[PDB]
Design a protein around this ligand. Structure first.
Ligand SMILES: C[NH+](C)c1cc(NC(=O)CNC(C)(C)C)c(O)c2c1C[C@H]1C[C@H]3[C@H]([NH+](C)C)C(O)=C(C(N)=O)C(=O)[C@@]3(O)C(O)=C1C2=O
Ligand SMILES: [K+]
Ligand SMILES: [Mg+2]
Ligand SMILES: [Mg+2]
Ligand SMILES: [Mg+2]
Ligand SMILES: [Mg+2]
Ligand SMILES: [Mg+2]
Ligand SMILES: [Mg+2]
Ligand SMILES: [Mg+2]
Ligand SMILES: [Mg+2]
Ligand SMILES: [Mg+2]
Ligand SMILES: [Mg+2]
Ligand SMILES: [Mg+2]
Ligand SMILES: [Mg+2]
Ligand SMILES: [Mg+2]
Ligand SMILES: [Mg+2]
Ligand SMILES: [Mg+2]
Ligand SMILES: [Mg+2]
Ligand SMILES: [Mg+2]
Ligand SMILES: [Mg+2]
Ligand SMILES: [Mg+2]
Lengths: 50, 171, 555, 115, 326, 101, 132, 49
RNA sequence: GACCUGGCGGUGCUUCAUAUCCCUCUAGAGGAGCCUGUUCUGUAAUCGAUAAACCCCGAUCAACCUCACCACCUCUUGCUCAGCCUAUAUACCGCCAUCUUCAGCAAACCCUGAUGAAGGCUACAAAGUAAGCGCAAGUACCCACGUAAAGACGUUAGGUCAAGGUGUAGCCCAUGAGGUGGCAAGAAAUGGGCUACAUUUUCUACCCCAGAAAACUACGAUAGCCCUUAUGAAACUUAAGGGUCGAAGGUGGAUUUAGC
RNA sequence: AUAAGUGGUUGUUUAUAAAAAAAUUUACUUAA
């Protein structure tokens, strides 16, 4: 389409949190979970509204 | 709540209690054993309590070359369908309360003398339908293990023979 | 519109129809539940709001007797609620607006005092003289032009032509001009009412036109289409008058729609050998319409293409069919091909004409494009593709045609499962084709064996039986071919002379005198006149003297 | 009898067909419609990745079969019609901020859900 | 007769890939290979495997961390496990005279290598003896580790004695190749600034600190960390002793100018990142023997010792909560 | 049809607290300043202390929406740790995995 | 010993699917997510409402196609759209499948106020990855 | 809205369009208990006054 | 009587022991005050965990609510095609502890023991072949390292009917539902922690070249009283700040934890 | 070659079973 475009990767985010592994006691035993968010930025330049 | 309802597989596994510490080491001594019932057995998709007739699912899609419309069985008619469903279930259960006559060997509760039929057919088409197989002795023999403890094995003695001079036995 | 699974893909035209009805049936049950239990669907999560994924409410929610509450029952097309409320409202003595009364009349007349059926709760005259609509007009104190017009139009739909004409008289007595729609409805009434010849109807028509001009009523497209629609009864006397009508519209400025030409081409295409008059007109019509984008203007615009194609195929005009099809594929014209019936008809005829009058290579191109992409064949249109393959002397494809035949639900069709064998056995072929047709042969053998019709009556065309046997011999499955002999005797199906004649060679190729004797012994039992001629050849070729007398002693 | 499934239509597909017609828009991977012997799945020991048919791993991919290079170029040709041209006078950012000193920023947030 | 329930012993479908089965797979790959090139708008006749992998990766994007779990479209011979061919004919006679040993391939090889040694008596780096897992694939026979070891002993016993060209090429069938990595420091390009002064620049990393150093070929001993004299940026002596270390070791205190930037970490991790960045940039202006000595002094290695995560249910990276016997 | 009566009592608290929020806001504003006369703020104190106790928003409890658990709930999903894990461990929560580092 | 979403070993006779054969520590390693939306991404909203919808639909589909599903649903969301990708068996009449596709799609679109589609993929039998 | 999810899925079961394996399980158990005589007593008209 | 298998032996020999034995190294706990569990006492006034593998444990958390408790007052087809935090974790699912800081569990065969319970090892090899499941490999994090994660079958009827669900038994004018108020204290005894006892310290400046302090507001309370503020409808209670107040404590008995 | 005492009670193997639901009209408009 004749648009000028540059791409880079912003650094990722890894959000972790811990939960208890058992229903009742055993506080020393945990399960840990994460959600990775990966990125890519498309830098377009000099565009008209249409 | 709709969201606390589980599946039949999860429900029977808990209710039957096949696993647990009771099973191990014969800790549980309750002979009475429930059996899983498939409650989906006689169920027809589209068949419900209100008796609606859905064209293409519960009833045929086309009638006389014409597409049927939503219809609902009469109250008196629905009673018969529900009453009939009860009968089939009962008779289905009836089949499973009938006790089978196990031909007895040397004694009523003995395995000796009972027949095991012909030996299983061999790999390369070898066949043994000439031979009969009678049990001679069943014994629960035990060993001790470091982890479990009393480990049961079954030692069985059978004899095979065609009745024409050829016979053997094995444990 | 179908699910794209090998197991849910429709495999016949019946399924193609049946699967779409099942999907639509489930949607009615959904819509039935959604509208029967609105409260379970009254939680709007959408942004922006989607009005069409909300439940519908069909019951009037205002029970107070007022003019506004009347509009609800009219808008909600609740015939019973309106009349009951109207009766009470009239007893109260309150005044009902003329417009409000007119709207109430339209609903009562349009449906002939018959409540439109929805969700859940033909032959003969449906109109009844003692109907409420008639009574309401008497109670109506003021009757405007719309009152007369609306009443006549409904009478036409319910075949109450005679009184509609009488009611039209009262309109004239009031010196009231009728609308365009009233005239269009009246045109059908006069023609459909009586079965007079065209000339008598033609005069009556001209009388109304003079009234129309006198009343300064400007005609519509429908106005003329109704004329052409009625003129199909006089299938030869209205031809020339029709050409006047067509040219007249073009003069006024009203461009003919597809419905117009539909009536025309139907009218001119009567049982006849030459049909050259029609022919010319069809050609001219298509030349006129080349590269013309159409818009829906008349309810019958969908029936054009199926008729056009039918005539094209009757005249066997391959170059004209390409123009008809060429027009359909321009712009958004394909949307006029109509329901599934119309669509199969079109493509069925269109393709029959292709197979007959087109090069084989181009027929196979159209074969791959149309099926099953656009059209699920019928049993016949496989036969035509077979014949066209024979005429082109391209029998290397017949195997493929058999597979496709199964894949479109024609595995058991009697007519089709025979032609394939005949053509495959008619002639000898190179080893390859011979073997190829022999594999196809066993494939069709399975079908004859597992016939579902066997539950009714197992049919075994001796010709089909012959072809199989021949092909099994040409492959080397003599043992399997010999098993067919048992089946002949079993079904009591005498073999064909050609099969019997070719059975001699089978023994020669095998050079097994033992088998040769078995063939003659069995054939002789049936005392077939052709068998006797064979026996003479066998006796000359190979026959033991001791065996000959044994055969004679049985006689 | 028991309804038999037809063969996959990948067999009736020409090795030179236009693939964009088969998957015009974004649609879930269908084994019966993709003529690739693609396998996915961590293999059992002395085994192979699992065949496309019934492979739930392949159905969990958001595939790009509706956006092949061919398809994209074709698409963008039909869309050149919609777009207008950048003022050739506004070559550099220097020229942009000479003629247009103000800049207005705003963000649009594309996310999946009913709202 | 008591009918015992027949156990479905062969539940597990055992891997059986008939030669015909493979050929139907190679057929489908070739047909599929052409469809893949067609979708990608490329020439079906030059579509290499690396084009198959790039295309499959794009059309079925998966982030699964294991590569063996991702979608693949490979030649059936690179996918299916190699299988031993039928070892006997229709009559039932095995084709190999060592069939009944169970390992005709391994013992055939052992028989051969033994003979080659026997004949020799009648006549008179960068390469590795293939591992066992390789020999088993070359022989298609599941092999014992003690089998392997005995086999290799013959081979080595073969090398010791004199061998002809024919024997050496045999041994080479089992001698693989090992690419040897050089522990030789890569030297940074010498560059030139606007005034024609020679410098090299390198990077260093220590914990969460990152340093970039520009070392000038000639100078006075001026280090300027983040635009500040090194003595003012690092008021702690130990920090300044770390910046001395690279230049002192090669006898170049007072001969170079350094401009570094560092960020992250604490003061002492910054000193060690700058030490590494300066040492690396300094490698361009010393001899290759001095570079090696700097490598053997530990001046050119990235320190991998970084903070270890705390674990749950513990007090620290290693520290446990108090354990209560009772 | 809520999981239990403790959830049902929270359903009602959340609903009543919503009904009175504007009134409660307006009355707090009067008594949350130094501008107004104290004799007026004292009336406001009385007025808001007379609104039903279940309109007080601090009485809302964030219970698991599936099992009604009053503690151990992650607020982004409104689920207890037992229920969250059950979905997370079967692969049914988009983009949520076991963390290892 | 861990238990969550592990199918135990048994006696070499238990058919298990690729999905069932993998424990939660394989969810981004050897297998993917049965749902895909944007709620659980950094900065995104409505993860809770997505999660309640996904728990209902799985339940809805399990009882609406009784005995037909051969594995777990794959739930997808793109903007306003919702895609339900089932793998079903080949025992029900295709007439019944079409009824249920049309029914479920319609009912769910009015319930969750969005365009909802349902892509079936029939298999003969449940695809067995491993005999545990 | 737990009132809507239970009431919807209850009519869908009474309509025949939803199979509730859990409610089927509980109905079976309820049916068996009734046979054993362990049926719920009528409210108010109970054993006690 | 004689065996088989396991266990155990203050049983032999030989190797070992990794912050997994001893001698070694560093910082702590056991004494003080405080904080927070538990027990015991009390109260009309919850339940669970309770050698290792309970004891800042369910709780990533209780002023009301939460709540299940107690007192009083109400309701009866009742938010629900009811309900029950009633009994039974020794009927169970679900999710886990524990060995495990393990390497073993093994179907199917074949052989040995006179065809006993059982057993199956030698590489210059003598009866074992074994598919699967663990370990391993792979993957996550910053690497081939390390740390995670993983870790079978079983053992401890180990924990959890009070996450939810549920078999069995029980309650149904009440063992259910709701409102108002209230308890949740300390003679103490013990577990874990926080802060100290000071000179490698205290206070300011600076965040590393300073000035002061240093046994009568030296060091030392995050504790008591007072005030204010924050949140809340509600704070004598909860938290933050300020002031006031300068307590015990002067490196802690038997014993005891952690770390490569 | 030091010395190391004790542990209420109680406890295990009685026998096998299975379902299907399903298929008449394969192409118009039209008229009396
Ligand atoms: C009376 N004893 C023999 C017993 C009985 C039952 N339950 C019944 O018999 C119940 N009977 C009904 C069903 C009510 C009729 C029991 O359920 C139990 C026990 C024993 C306990 C012992 C528990 C013990 N501690 C916590 C007090 C313990 O430390 C152990 C241990 N292994 O170290 C236990 O086993 C113990 O926790 C436990 O589980 C017991 C029971 O389960
Ligand atoms: K219970
Ligand atoms: Mg663990
Ligand atoms: Mg530490
Ligand atoms: Mg012993
Ligand atoms: Mg302490
Ligand atoms: Mg202490
Ligand atoms: Mg307590
Ligand atoms: Mg307790
Ligand atoms: Mg307990
Ligand atoms: Mg204990
Ligand atoms: Mg209670
Ligand atoms: Mg237990
Ligand atoms: Mg348990
Ligand atoms: Mg007991
Ligand atoms: Mg590693
Ligand atoms: Mg771990
Ligand atoms: Mg591992
Ligand atoms: Mg217990
Ligand atoms: Mg004593
Ligand atoms: Mg004892």
């Amino acid at each position: 389409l004749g648009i000028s475009i540059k791409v880079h990767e912003p650094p990722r985010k890894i959000e972790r949190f811990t939960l208890l592994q058992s229903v009742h006691i055993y506080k020393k035993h945990r399960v840990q979970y994460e959600m990775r968010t990966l990125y890519r930025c498309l830098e377009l330049e000099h565009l008209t509204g249409s | 709540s709709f969201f606390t309802k589980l599946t039949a597989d999860e429900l029977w596994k808990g209710a039957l209690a096949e696993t647990g510490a009771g099973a191990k080491k014969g800790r549980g001594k309750r002979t009475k054993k429930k059996k899983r019932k498939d409650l989906n057995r006689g169920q027809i998709i589209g068949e419900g309590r209100y008796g609606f007739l859905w064209p293409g699912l519960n009833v045929p899609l086309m009638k006389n070359g014409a597409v049927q419309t939503i219809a609902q069985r009469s109250k008196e008619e629905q009673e018969k369908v529900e009453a009939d469903m009860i009968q089939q279930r009962e008779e289905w259960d009836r089949k499973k309360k009938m006790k089978v006559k196990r031909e007895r060997g040397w004694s009523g509760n003995s395995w000796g003398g009972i027949s095991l039929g012909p030996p299983d057919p061999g790999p390369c088409g070898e066949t043994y339908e000439d031979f009969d197989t009678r049990i001679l002795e069943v014994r629960n023999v035990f060993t001790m293990t470091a982890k479990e403890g009393r480990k049961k094995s079954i030692r069985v003695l059978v004899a095979v023979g065609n009745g024409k001079g050829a016979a053997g036995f094995s444990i | 519109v179908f699910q794209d699974d090998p197991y849910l893909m429709p495999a016949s035209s019946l399924e193609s129809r049946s699967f779409l009805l099942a999907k639509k049936s489930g949607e009615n049950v959904a819509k039935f539940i959604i509208n029967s239990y609105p409260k379970y669907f009254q939680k709007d999560i959408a942004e922006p709001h989607i009005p069409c994924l909300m439940p519908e409410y069909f019951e009037p929610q205002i029970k107070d007797i007022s003019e506004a509450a009347l509009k609800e029952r009219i808008e909600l097309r609740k015939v019973k609620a309106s009349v009951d409320m109207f009766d009470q409202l009239l007893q109260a003595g309150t005044t009902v607006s003329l417009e409000t009364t007119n709207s109430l009349l339209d609903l009562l007349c349009y449906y002939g005092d018959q409540e439109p059926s929805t969700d859940y709760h033909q032959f003969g005259v449906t109109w009844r003289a003692k109907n409420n609509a008639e009574r309401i007009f008497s109670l109506m104190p003021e009757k405007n032009e719309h009152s007369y017009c609306t009443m006549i139009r409904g009478m036409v739909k319910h075949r109450a032509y005679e009184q509609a004409l009488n009611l039209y008289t009262e309109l004239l007595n009031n010196r009231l001009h009728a609308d365009v729609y009233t005239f269009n409805a009246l045109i059908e009434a006069t023609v459909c009412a009586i079965n007079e010849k065209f000339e008598e109807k033609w005069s009556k028509i001209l009388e109304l036109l003079r009234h129309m001009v006198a009343q300064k009523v400007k005609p519509n497209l429908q106005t003329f289409n109704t004329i052409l629609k009625c003129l199909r009864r006089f299938h030869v006397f209205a031809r020339s008058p029709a050409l006047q009508v067509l040219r007249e519209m073009k003069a006024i400025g009203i461009e003919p729609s597809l419905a117009t030409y539909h009536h025309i081409i139907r009218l001119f295409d009567q049982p006849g050998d030459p049909l050259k008059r029609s022919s010319f007109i069809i050609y001219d019509i298509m030349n006129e319409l080349m590269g013309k984008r159409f818009s829906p203007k008349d309810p019958d615009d969908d029936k054009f293409f199926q008729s056009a194609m039918s005539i094209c195929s009757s005249l066997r005009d391959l170059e004209l069919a390409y123009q008809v099809h060429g027009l359909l594929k321009t712009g958004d014209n394909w949307k006029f091909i109509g329901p599934d019936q119309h669509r199969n008809f079109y493509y069925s005829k269109f393709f029959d004409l292709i197979c007959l009058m087109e090069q084989i290579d181009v027929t196979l191109k159209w074969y791959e494009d149309l099926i099953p992409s656009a059209y699920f064949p019928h049993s016949q249109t496989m036969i035509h593709l077979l014949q066209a393959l024979d005429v082109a002397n391209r029998l290397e494809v017949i195997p493929k045609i058999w597979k496709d035949s199964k894949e479109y639900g024609h595995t058991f069709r009697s007519d089709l499962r025979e032609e394939i064998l005949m053509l495959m056995a008619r002639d000898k072929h190179p080893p390859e084709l011979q073997v190829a047709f022999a594999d196809c042969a066993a494939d069709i053998k399975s079908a004859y064996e597992s016939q579902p019709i066997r539950q009714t009556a197992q049919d075994w065309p001796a010709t089909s039986l012959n072809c199989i046997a021949i092909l099994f011999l040409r492959a080397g499955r003599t043992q399997e071919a010999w098993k067919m002999l048992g089946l002949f005797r079993k079904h009591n199906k005498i073999p064909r002379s050609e099969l019997l004649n070719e059975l001699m060679d089978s023994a020669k190729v095998s050079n097994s005198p033992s088998q040769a004797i078995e063939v003659v012994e069995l054939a002789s039992a049936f005392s077939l006149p052709i068998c006797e001629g064979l026996t003479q050849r066998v006796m000359s070729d190979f026959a033991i003297n001791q065996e000959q007398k044994e055969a004679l002693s049985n006689l | 009898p028991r309804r038999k499934a037809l063969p996959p239509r990948t067999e009736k597909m020409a090795v030179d067909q236009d693939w964009p017609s088969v998957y015009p828009v974004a649609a879930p991977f269908k084994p019966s419609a993709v003529p690739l012997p693609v396998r996915m799945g961590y293999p059992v020991k002395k085994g192979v990745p699992m065949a496309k048919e019934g492979n739930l791993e392949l159905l969990k991919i958001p595939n790009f079969l509706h956006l092949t290079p061919v398809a994209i170029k074709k698409h963008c040709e039909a869309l050149k019609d919609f777009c207008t041209e950048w003022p050739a006078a506004l070559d550099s950012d220097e020229k942009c901020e000479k003629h247009f000193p103000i800049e207005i920023d705003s963000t649009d947030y594309v996310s999946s859900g009913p709202s | 007769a008591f009918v015992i329930p027949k156990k479905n012993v062969p539940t597990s479908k055992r891997e059986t890939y008939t030669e015909d089965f493979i050929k139907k797979q190679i057929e489908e790959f070739n047909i599929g290979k052409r469809h893949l090139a067609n979708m990608m708008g490329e020439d079906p006749e030059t579509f290499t495997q690396e084009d198959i992998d790039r295309a499959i990766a794009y059309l079925f994007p998966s982030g699964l961390f294991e590569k063996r779990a991702r979608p693949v479209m490979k030649h059936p011979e690179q996918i299916f496990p190699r299988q031993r061919a039928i070892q006997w004919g229709e009559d039932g006679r095995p084709f190999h005279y060592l069939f009944y040993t169970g390992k005709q391939s391994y013992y055939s090889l052992m028989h051969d290598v033994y003979g080659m040694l026997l004949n020799l008596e009648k006549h008179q780096i960068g390469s590795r003896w293939l591992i066992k897992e390789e020999l088993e694939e070359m022989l298609v026979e599941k092999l014992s580790d003690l089998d392997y070891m005995q086999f290799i002993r013959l081979l080595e016993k073969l090398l010791t004695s004199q061998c002809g060209a024919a024997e050496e090429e045999f041994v080479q069938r089992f001698r693989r190749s090992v690419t040897l990595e050089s522990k030789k420091q890569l030297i940074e390009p010498v560059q030139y600034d606007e005034q024609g002064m020679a410098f090299s620049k390198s990077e260093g990393k220590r914990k969460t600190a990152k340093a970039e150093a520009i070392v000038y070929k000639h100078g006075s001993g001026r280090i300027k960390v983040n635009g500040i004299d090194y003595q003012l940026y690092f008021p702690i002596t130990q920090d300044r002793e770390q910046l001395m270390f690279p230049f002192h070791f090669v006898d170049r205190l007072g001969k170079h100018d350094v401009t570094c930037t560092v960020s992250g970490g604490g003061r002492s991790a910054q000193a060690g990142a700058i030490r590494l960045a300066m040492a690396k940039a300094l490698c361009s202006f010393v001899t290759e023997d001095e570079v090696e000595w700097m490598r053997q002094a530990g001046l050119l290695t990235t320190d991998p010792r970084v903070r270890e995560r705390k674990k749950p249910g513990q007090e620290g990276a290693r520290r446990k909560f108090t354990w209560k016997k009772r | 049809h809520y999981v239990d009566w403790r959830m049902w009592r929270d359903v009602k608290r959340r609903k009543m607290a919503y009904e009175y929020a504007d009134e409660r806001l307006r009355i707090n504003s009067l008594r949350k300043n130094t501008i107004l006369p104290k004799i007026l703020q004292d009336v406001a104190d009385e007025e808001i202390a007379a609104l039903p106790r279940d309109s007080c928003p601090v009485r809302i409890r964030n219970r698991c929406v599936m099992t009604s658990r009053p503690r151990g709930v992650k607020r982004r999903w409104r689920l207890s740790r037992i229920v969250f894990r059950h979905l997370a461990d079967h692969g049914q929560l988009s983009g949520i995995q076991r963390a290892t580092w | 010993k861990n238990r969550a979403a592990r199918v135990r070993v048994s006696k070499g006779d238990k058919p298990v699917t690729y999905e069932e054969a993998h424990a939660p520590h394989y969810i981004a390693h050897r297998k993917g997510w049965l749902s895909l939306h944007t709620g659980n991404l950094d900065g995104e909203d409505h993860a809770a409402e997505r999660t309640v919808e996904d728990v209902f639909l799985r339940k809805f589909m399990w009882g609406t196609f009784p005995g037909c599903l051969a594995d777990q649903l794959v739930l997808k969301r793109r903007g306003n759209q919702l895609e339900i990708c089932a793998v079903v068996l080949r025992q029900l009449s295709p007439h019944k499948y079409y009824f249920l596709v049309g029914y479920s799609e319609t009912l769910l679109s009015y319930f969750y106020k969005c365009p909802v589609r349902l892509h079936l993929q029939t298999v003969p039998s449940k695809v067995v990855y491993k005999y545990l | 809205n737990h009132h809507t999810y239970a009431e919807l899925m209850q009519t869908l079961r009474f309509l025949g369009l939803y199979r509730d394996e859990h409610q089927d399980f509980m109905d079976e158990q309820k049916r068996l208990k009734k046979l054993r005589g362990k049926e719920k007593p009528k409210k108010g008209e109970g054993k006690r006054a």
